[PDB]
């Protein structure tokens, strides 16, 4: 019954010339477009109610995915003229999502994470999946303590990278204005107020932002 | 008085079909063969004593460069039947280089680095130029510490990519055997013994492995 | 009055990585985008009715030039999603050009040619401006006979290069199919049929296909 939102609509400028032709969620990985892999992973978690925003070559996405029935779910689309940010894109799509907490997955993300574990405790505004810091961003985004509480980064020991996977409560967006803005300052505001839980994903995860990262994904899919 | 070695770098498979009829060193960058530009970059650094090994279509390299007089220096060739590796290529050529530390420049590298600043302190076996990690190799190869000391990579960051530019001591090859082998294991052993310095090059550098990256060299060569 | 077709949908693969983020027409030459310099050169000639095609990042070309009036003219856009080539881009734009002969300006080309002297004699299908063979193309393309007629390459003499500037008649494109194709097979047929005049421009001309040839245009504006 929980909905999922795939945050697409990024240009993929670091992935040109490919993304001159096709938007990044439609890039094939091991023969299957990334976003299709994402939606089938949500499907085997029990989540078949999907909201997808797009801006860059977005008509290709709707034409490839249809209404989702081909993959056994329902897709409601949030078309953007100009790109909203990680946060503006979600805020614009809030009417499609409703009042309940929803799953958030960034279009750029591949993982083997068990989406069915995701759960937002009553009182929290956000639950974040965190990963080991990748070599290209070794500093981390957030600290995660033993009680699974997300804080701002500490001097050293405990800092992890936001994976792009979360459960978000709509109230996180109270007072927001219709436009482009990033998700992170809203999470930092909920973090300052102590209302963000998190977990450390220890299995595989790739931010598919470059050709090299796409290769790492396709090497991981070619294991078993 | 210091000699320089332009090190072969391979058959240029990623740059077919061009490398079927023209080896990589002779592929033109803005109308001048890449290897000619490297020799002239060394010449403006005061280094006109050059050693060049070749394996793929090496008869064309000798034919174009000759003995180096046309460029103001002298060339000794180290022809190879079958390719030696980055390490074995140098080792095979060590008699041409003789006793003193020598400059090493990987034959598929272009940079704006000031080669004349290269210097190997006594007791060290190698001095390495390191660059920012490029998109196609984002984890880098070595850590550089505050004192200019090269180490293995550290998860906390500050890791840098080996540029293919260095000064090496012939004793770095103590005990080596004729054959093909890579340079990295010799560097790892000298690093472990604490005998490798390095510096961070903050200027331009391109690993010319594709035509797309050749175009980026040409953008650099045309600046102003 | 004569319309102009500016071919601005080129791939610009040789000028990567720049052309991954900015289409080549928008790349600056001594402070001014190349297509702006071409359109103002056309305006100086009294040619102010412009048709422009675009492909990759073509949206950036409409966002910069708009309706054309800030450069003294009017623009009709021929949006191609994926690049048709020289021949295909013109053919797709023919509805916007109409029935009359039209000025053709390739987007790669910088020159100080006097566009006002372009004419198409009745009967002819094309009038081509030819230049000296440049260093990156030393073999050349065609041959200019004393009557201002263009002819097929002679192992005897007169090799000149097509400069990307021309007047074209729409009937050149008859029997053509929607698709990507180069103009030169068409021109080669029209040259063999004796239906192509030309002239030999002796002023400056640079085919801006590489970063160095862009550098060359900036030295000239200087």
CA-only gyration radius of chain B, Å: 17
Experimental method: X-ray
- A23 with A8: CB under 8 angstroms? yes
| Peptide bond connecting A134 to the previous residue in cis, omega within 30 degrees of 0 | no
At A187, phi and psi to the nearest 5? -65, -40
Closest CA to C99 of C178, C171, C195, C190: C171
d(CA A48, CA C89) in angstroms, rounded, equals 44
Give the pair of three-digit tokens for residue B131: 């660059």
For residue C79, the SS3 value is strand
Location of structure tokens 């499907």: A43
First to last CA, chain A: 31
CATH of domain C4-220: 3.90.550.10
Given a contact cutoff of 8 angstroms between Cβ atoms, the answer to whether A119 and A129 are in contact is: no
Residue C112 exposed, middle or buried by CB count within 10 Å (0-12, 13-18, 19+): exposed
Neighbours of A86 (CB within 10 A): 20
Resolution to 1 decimal, in Å?
Answer: 2.3
Answer whether C58 touches A (CB < 8 Å).
no
Considering only alpha carbons, which residue of chain B is nearest residue A132? B155
Q: Which residue of B has its CA nearest to A160?
A: B156
- C55 in Cβ contact with C13 (< 8 Å): no
d(CA B146, CA B70): 43
What is the secondary structure of A20-52 as a DSSP string?
A: HHS-GGGSEETTEEHHHHHHHHHHTTT--EEEE
Contact A130, A200 (CB under 8 A): yes
Q: What are phi and psi of B171, to 5 degrees?
A: -65, -10
For residue C28, the chain B residues in CB contact (below 8 A) are none
Fold entry, domain A4-221: Spore Coat Polysaccharide Biosynthesis Protein SpsA; Chain A (3.90.550)
- Would you give the DSSP letter of residue C184? H
* Other Cβ atoms within 10 Å of C147 Cβ, number: 6
How far apart, in whole angstroms, are the C-alpha atoms of residue C69 and residue B91? 67
CB of B77 within 8 A of CB of B53? yes
Distance from C-alpha of A69 to C-alpha of B71, rounded to nearest angstrom: 68
* A21–C20 C-beta distance less than 8 A: no
Q: Which residues of B touch A135 (CB under 8 A)?
A: 133, 138-140, 159
Question: Do A212 and B159 lie within an 8 Å CB cutoff?
Answer: no
Q: Does C82 touch chain A (CB under 8 A)?
A: yes
Spatial neighbors of B132 by CB under 8 A, at least 6 apart, are: B160, B161, B202
C56 in contact with A, Cβ within 8 Å: yes
In angstroms, rounded to a whole number, what is the distance separating the alpha carbons of residues A195 and A8? 26
User: What span, in angstroms and rounded, lies between the C-alpha atoms of C9 and C23?
Assistant: 8
d(CA C172, CA C189) in angstroms, rounded, equals 9
DSSP state of B187: H
Contact yes or no for C118/C137 (Cβ under 8 A): no
Q: Are B107 and B35 in contact (CB under 8 A)?
A: yes
> Phi and psi of A147, rounded to 5°?
-80, 15
Q: Give the separation between CA B170 and CA A214, rounded to whole angstroms.
A: 40
Closest CA to C202 of C160, C142, C146, C157: C160
Residue with tokens 């490297």: B38
Decide: A161 and A132 in contact? Cβ < 8 Å: yes
Number of H helices, E strands in chain C: 5, 13
Q: Is B133 in the A-facing interface, judged by CB distances under 8 Å? A: yes
Tell me how far apart the alpha carbons of residues B37 and C159 are, in angstroms, rounded to a whole number.
32
Q: How far apart are CA C37 and CA C15, in angstroms?
A: 19
B146 touches chain C (CB under 8 A): no
CA distances from B167 to A125, B94, B123, B129 (A): 56, 13, 13, 9
In what helix (H) or strand (E) does residue C191 lie, and over which residues does it extend? helix C184-192
Note the helical H segments in chain B: 18-21, 34-43, 58-65, 86-97, 184-192, 211-221
Rounded Cα distance, B165 and B185, in Å: 17
Q: Do residue A210 and residue B157 have CB atoms under 8 angstroms apart?
A: no
Task: Sort out which chain C residues have CB atoms less than 8 A from B221's CB and list them.
Answer: 211-212
Q: Which two tokens stand for residue A139?
A: 């500093």
Torsion-angle region of residue B146: left (phi > 0), alpha (psi -120 to 50) or beta?
alpha
Residues 6+ apart with CB under 8 A from B20: none
User: What 8-state DSSP symbol labels residue C134?
Assistant: P
Residue C78 CB neighbour total at 10 angstroms: 23
Cis (ω within 30 of 0) for the bond into A184? no
Strands A4-7 and A49-54: parallel
Describe the crossing of helices B34-43 and B58-65 by its angle, rounded to 10 degrees.
50
In this structure, are residues C87 and C182 in contact, taking their beta carbons and an 8 Å threshold? yes
Q: Are strands A205-207 and B32-33 parallel, antiparallel or unpaired?
A: unpaired
The minimal CB distance from B218 to the residues C135, C136, C210 is found for C210
DSSP string, A66-90: TTSGGGTSEEEEEE-SS---HHHHH
B68-B69-B73 Cα angle (round to 5): 65
Beta bridge partners of C167: C103, C127
Contacts of C95 (CB under 8 A, 6+ apart): none
CB count within 10 Å of CB C21 equals: 13
Neighboring chain A residues of B159 at a CB cutoff of 8 Å? 135
Q: Which residue of B has its CA nearest to A155?
A: B156
Map tokens 């966002």 to a residue.
C63
CA distance B115 to B124: 18
Chain A nearest CA to B162, separation (Å): 16
């Amino acid at each position: 019954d929980m909905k999922a939102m795939i945050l697409a609509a990024g240009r993929g400028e670091r992935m040109r010339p490919t993304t001159l032709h096709t938007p990044k969620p439609l890039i094939e990985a091991a023969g299957v477009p990334l976003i299709e892999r994402q939606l089938l992973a949500l499907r085997q978690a029990g989540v078949d109610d999907w909201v997808i925003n797009h801006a860059w070559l977005g008509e290709q996405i709707e034409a490839y995915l249809g209404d989702g029935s081909r993959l056994g779910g329902r897709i409601a689309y949030s078309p953007e003229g100009e790109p909203l940010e990680t946060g503006g894109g979600i805020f614009r799509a809030l009417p499609l999502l409703g009042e309940q907490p929803f799953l958030l997955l960034n279009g750029d993300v591949w993982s083997d994470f068990d989406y069915s574990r995701l759960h937002l405790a009553d009182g929290d505004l956000a639950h974040l999946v965190l990963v080991d810091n990748p070599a290209h961003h070794p500093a981390g985004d957030f600290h995660l303590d033993a009680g699974g509480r997300v804080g701002e980064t500490r001097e050293a020991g405990g800092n992890l990278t936001y994976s792009g996977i979360a459960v978000l409560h709509p109230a996180l967006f109270e007072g927001c204005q219709p436009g482009a803005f990033k998700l992170a300052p809203l999470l930092r505001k909920a973090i300052a107020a102590g209302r963000v839980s998190g977990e450390h994903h220890r299995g595989q995860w790739v931010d598919v932002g470059t050709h090299e990262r796409l290769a790492e994904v396709e090497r991981l899919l070619a294991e078993h």
